[PDB]
Amino acid sequence: MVRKVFNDGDILYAEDVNIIGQPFVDGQDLLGHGLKVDDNSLSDEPQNIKTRFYA
Amino acid sequence: VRKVFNDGDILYAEDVNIIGQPFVDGQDLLGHGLKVDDNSLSDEPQNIKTRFYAWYNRFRVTVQSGLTLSVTQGSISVSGNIISFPPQTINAIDNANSFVWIGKTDADPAIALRVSQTLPNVCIPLARVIAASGSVTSVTDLRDVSVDILPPSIPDAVPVGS
Amino acid sequence: PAIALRVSQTLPNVCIPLARVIAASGSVTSVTDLRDVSVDILPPSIPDAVPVGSTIISLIPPTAPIPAGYLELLNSSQNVSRTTYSALFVLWGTYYGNGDGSTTFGVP
Amino acid sequence: TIISLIPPTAPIPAGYLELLNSSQNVSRTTYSALFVLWGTYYGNGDGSTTFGVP
């Protein structure tokens, strides 16, 4: 999102689409790297690590 | 997810900026994908997944088939000596409320996985299995990391003057 | 008696085990984690009381009261209730007499 | 030493060594707390692996 921001007349290049195609959750500043994963982002399913660890 | 595109729609810069920032949280929005399950977590070692489950699922007893129960791999410490066990199987005692544990008997010094009808005083309890008619009706986890085993009462000392 | 981090040759019966280290030529070949996160400790034994059915000899005068949790051996066999002394009845049976044969058993 | 009247069919209490008619030789390492206390005083079953039992 940061270091690559689009505007109304901006061309959409194939490299940008390929980058967005691989989402990253490392919290980095790049185009496809969204944000880190907190406890909420983990699934609230009883069979998952969050529920077991909190139990 | 929330906003849906179709033929004839015009892509907007804000749409790409939203899409460019993925959020994994299960929220129903354009860029918010879904909630992270165990599979989405990295499976190679030196990661919280395998680290957590190698301790959580240690010597866990499950009904493999019929009276045959599966015990996951693990390790035990006997006076500082580490003895490792691969995943093994053992047959429950039929028509009984038996106990699956790890230890030894008076007639056998080898430390191994055993099924009895009464928990020995010195053992590592694993499960209480209720089985009937060649089938395992229920399994109750005894080595659970959430259940806490209270220690036994202080032994009655020899009476003074005796 | 001070509680601290100690490197010994054999783990004491009561302690918090941390690791086992194998050292050769002034170098550490291996360190094995003895904590709960890696291993499950098997107790060598439990602290136990005097076993049921064992006999202890005492010098206490007759005026002193009978110790709790014990039965007194008399000049003749006794008939003791099986329900009250279920532990002793289990460990002994009727090997010292059948008592009535239904609800009591004999004590030598 | 604990004296008991339990019948032969009754199991030996755990953590106890039965004393039979003759002497025995039990492993020093298996019974370490016993060997450090008694010592080689009731016999030397072997050189450095077992010790005697009256």
PDB file of C-alpha atoms in Angstrom, chain D residues 10-44:
ATOM      1  CA  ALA D  10      -0.458 -60.965  48.984  1.00  0.00           C
ATOM      2  CA  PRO D  11       1.798 -58.809  46.775  1.00  0.00           C
ATOM      3  CA  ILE D  12       4.972 -57.291  48.186  1.00  0.00           C
ATOM      4  CA  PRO D  13       4.517 -53.598  49.077  1.00  0.00           C
ATOM      5  CA  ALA D  14       6.157 -51.416  46.458  1.00  0.00           C
ATOM      6  CA  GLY D  15       9.640 -50.164  47.228  1.00  0.00           C
ATOM      7  CA  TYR D  16      10.376 -53.081  49.571  1.00  0.00           C
ATOM      8  CA  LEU D  17      12.900 -55.916  49.381  1.00  0.00           C
ATOM      9  CA  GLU D  18      11.810 -59.323  50.658  1.00  0.00           C
ATOM     10  CA  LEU D  19      14.221 -61.205  52.916  1.00  0.00           C
ATOM     11  CA  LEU D  20      14.297 -64.906  52.076  1.00  0.00           C
ATOM     12  CA  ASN D  21      15.807 -67.895  53.863  1.00  0.00           C
ATOM     13  CA  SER D  22      19.333 -67.399  52.511  1.00  0.00           C
ATOM     14  CA  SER D  23      21.421 -64.386  51.573  1.00  0.00           C
ATOM     15  CA  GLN D  24      20.827 -62.510  48.324  1.00  0.00           C
ATOM     16  CA  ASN D  25      22.848 -60.260  46.024  1.00  0.00           C
ATOM     17  CA  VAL D  26      21.034 -57.192  44.712  1.00  0.00           C
ATOM     18  CA  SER D  27      22.335 -54.600  42.276  1.00  0.00           C
ATOM     19  CA  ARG D  28      24.093 -51.617  43.821  1.00  0.00           C
ATOM     20  CA  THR D  29      22.714 -49.243  41.187  1.00  0.00           C
ATOM     21  CA  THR D  30      19.143 -50.561  41.405  1.00  0.00           C
ATOM     22  CA  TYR D  31      19.133 -50.094  45.193  1.00  0.00           C
ATOM     23  CA  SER D  32      21.447 -47.113  45.589  1.00  0.00           C
ATOM     24  CA  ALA D  33      19.932 -45.558  48.714  1.00  0.00           C
ATOM     25  CA  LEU D  34      20.222 -48.975  50.347  1.00  0.00           C
ATOM     26  CA  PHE D  35      23.822 -49.584  49.274  1.00  0.00           C
ATOM     27  CA  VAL D  36      25.086 -46.173  50.385  1.00  0.00           C
ATOM     28  CA  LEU D  37      23.653 -46.869  53.853  1.00  0.00           C
ATOM     29  CA  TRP D  38      24.293 -50.579  54.419  1.00  0.00           C
ATOM     30  CA  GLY D  39      27.492 -50.755  52.424  1.00  0.00           C
ATOM     31  CA  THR D  40      29.278 -54.010  51.726  1.00  0.00           C
ATOM     32  CA  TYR D  41      28.492 -55.121  55.281  1.00  0.00           C
ATOM     33  CA  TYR D  42      26.208 -58.111  54.656  1.00  0.00           C
ATOM     34  CA  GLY D  43      28.414 -59.488  51.881  1.00  0.00           C
ATOM     35  CA  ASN D  44      29.944 -58.828  48.465  1.00  0.00           C
TER      36      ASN D  44
END
